[PDB]
Amino acid sequence: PQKPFDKFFIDYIGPLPPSQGYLYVLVVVDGMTGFTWLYPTKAPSTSATVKSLNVLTSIAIPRVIHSDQGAAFTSSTFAEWAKERGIHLEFSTPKVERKNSDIKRLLTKLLVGRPTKWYDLLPVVQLALNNTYSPVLKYTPHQLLFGIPFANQDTLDLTREEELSLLQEIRTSLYH
Amino acid sequence: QKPFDKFFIDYIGPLPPSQGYLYVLVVVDGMTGFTWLYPTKAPSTSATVKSLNVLTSIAIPRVIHSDQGAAFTSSTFAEWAKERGIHLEFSTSKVERKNSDIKRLLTKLLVGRPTKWYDLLPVVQLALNNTYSPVLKYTPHQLLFGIDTLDLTREEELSLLQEIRTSLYHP
């Protein structure tokens, strides 16, 4: 039966307006838990993908990485990286589905009136996604990954007005 | 005490350059002993903030503990911390000696690998967090994620495990 960190779904969102030089978000979604990692990058490149996944796979090495035919994932350099780590690459052909819809939508709404600030608020976006309940499942992505680290479970330890307000804004989009 | 209460941060390096990288930011969780490693090009406030933004996307730590390094005593880092709600404290305990031994072992591991330290960095982290330490009675990974993953076959990977195990278990 499927475990956390068994399978990753990866995608690039962007370009978004420049925000401290960043233009894209590498989205990583765990197959079993629904847990989302957001990595800001300057380009949707193999290079940025490898660096981000080297950080993530310092935790655990996935068996499978699934992605579309983006240039970052179909390169020989990305294929070589995966081969070295023993990871299989899966490519898409015509919980995880609705996860990526929600992120593009959340990041779009986040820009209104503060387009160059999405980079600063990205940690709060990830934090809200992983600590919000999904329709059919009984646990948050975070509960499922960490077993069922916060000093305050309501605010998720956020203290800054715009971040707390952001949490609220995201819960409203996810629950309504 | 819960995980993410207190982080201990520091830089190792400079190390022989590898595709531009020269430094490793070391973040150690006070309660679990879990270590996160991030390669950087400089021991800068900027690299530190980029790495910590990634980590604090998981949970916001109450306290970050560091030395007087330029990265950590800057006003930029003060502003970043105050905005996130994190108390910065600076050095002038079972938890303090554990973190010190992690740094010594890590330095030994990275310095001992002048041409490969960067490429092996994720393996350094995984092997360290998933090795039984007699001081913890668990692996750091178990203490973080809830109380085998080290089935690594490559020559450089077994060499890492062997060296960590020797350091921890030999009298």
Q: Which residue of B has its CA nearest to A4?
A: B145
Binding residues of B for Mg(2+): 5, 67
Pairwise CB contact (< 8 Å): B4 & A150: yes
Q: What angle do CA B58, B64, B69 make, to 5 degrees?
A: 125
Give the angle subtended at the CA of B38 by the CAs of B83 and A99, to the nearest 5°.
Answer: 70
Q: Nearest Cβ partner of A122 from B2, B57, B129?
A: B57
Chain B residues whose CB is inside 8 A of the A152 CB are none
Residue A118, CB-side half-sphere exposure with 13 Å CA sphere: 29
All residues of chain B having their beta carbon less than 8 Å from the beta carbon of residue A123 are: 53-54, 56-57
Amino acid at A86: G
Q: Is B33 left (phi over 0), alpha (psi -120 to 50) or beta?
A: left
Contact B140, B35 (CB under 8 A): yes
CATH code, A23: 3.30.420.10
Quickly tell me which residue has 């750091």 as its tokens. Answer: B140
Alpha-carbon distance A45 to A72, whole Å? Answer: 5
Distance CA A27, CA A130 (A): 13
A92 CB-contact burial (10 Å; exposed 0-12 / middle 13-18 / buried 19+): exposed
What are the angstrom distances between the C-alpha of A119 and each of A25, A35, A38, A170, B105?
Answer: 9, 20, 10, 16, 34
Helix, coil or strand: residue A60: coil
The letter for the amino acid at B41 is K
Structure tokens at B63: 């306290």
CB A41 within 8 Å of CB A141 = no
Two tokens at A29?
């979604």
Cβ count within 10 A of residue A172: 10
Give the C-alpha separation, B54 to B40, whole Å: 14
A82 touches chain B (CB under 8 A): no
How many angstroms is the resolution?
2.0
Q: Give the residue numbers spanning the domain of A117.
A: 1-176
Which three-class secondary structure state does DSSP give residue B152? coil
Report the alpha-carbon distance of residue B59 to residue B155 in Å, rounded.
35
CA B34 – CA A25 distance, rounded (Å): 26
Q: How many domains does chain A have?
A: 1
Q: Hey, are the CB atoms on A38 and B57 less than 8 Å from each other? A: yes
Helix (H) or strand (E) holding B38, with range, is strand B35-40
8 Å CB contact of A157 and B54: no
How many CB atoms sit inside 10 A of residue A140's CB?
19
Residue B139: count of CB within 10 angstroms of its CB: 22
DSSP letters, A104-142, are HHHHHHHHTT-GGGHHHHHHHHHHHHHTS--SS-SS-HH
> To which H or E segment does residue B9 belong?
strand B6-12
Q: How far is CA A79 from the centre of its chain?
A: 21
Nearest to A110 by CA among A33, A13, A34: A13
Q: Is B146 on the interface with A (CB under 8 A)?
A: yes
Q: Is the dihedral of CA A133, A138, A144, A150 positive or negative?
A: positive
Kindly state the tokens that stand for B1: 């005490």
What is the rounded CA–CA span in Å between residue A161 and residue B40? 31
**If DSSP codes are grouped into helix, strand and coil, which group holds residue A53?**
helix
- As a whole number of angstroms, the distance between CA B73 and CA A71 comes to 41
Residues in A closer than 8 angstroms to B59, CB to CB, are 127, 149-150, 156-157
Distance between CA atoms of residues B20 and A153, nearest Å? 40
A89: closest CA of chain B, how far (Å): 19
Nearest to A20 by CA among A150, A85, A114: A114
Q: Which residues of B touch A149 (CB under 8 A)?
A: 2-4, 58-59
Contact A66, A41 (CB under 8 A): no
Parallel, antiparallel, or unpaired for β B63-66 and B87-90? parallel
Cα torsion B102, B128, B37, B53: sign = negative
Pairing of strands B6-12, B63-66: parallel
Only one residue has tokens 């740094």, namely B103
Partner-chain residue, chosen from A60, A130, A151, that has the shortest CB–CB distance to B149? A60
| CA of A47 vs chain B CAs: smallest distance (Å) | 11
* Shortest CA gap A41–chain B (Å): 11
CB contact under 8 A, B59 and A127: yes
Q: What is the largest CA-CA distance in chain B?
A: 46
Q: Chain A residues with CB inside 8 Å of B125's CB?
A: 58-59
Provide the strand spans (E) within A23-107.
24-30, 36-41, 64-67, 88-91
Q: How many helices (H) and strands (E) does chain B have?
A: 7, 5
What CA–CA distance (Å, rounded) separates A99 from A58?
24
How many CA atoms lie less than 13 Å away from A55 in the CB half-sphere? 26
Technique used to solve these coordinates: X-ray
* Contact predicate B95/B6, CB 8 Å: yes
Structure tokens at B122: 């994720």
Test A123 with B57 for CB contact under 8 angstroms. yes
Q: Give the angle subtended at the CA of A17 by the CAs of A14 and A19, to the nearest 5°.
A: 105
Which residues are within 8 A (CB) of A138 and not within 5 positions of it... i.e. 6 or more apart?
none
CB of A61 within 8 Å of a chain B CB? The answer is yes
Interface membership of A39 toward B (CB under 8 Å): yes
The number of angstroms, rounded, from the C-alpha of B169 to the middle of its chain's C-alpha atoms is 20
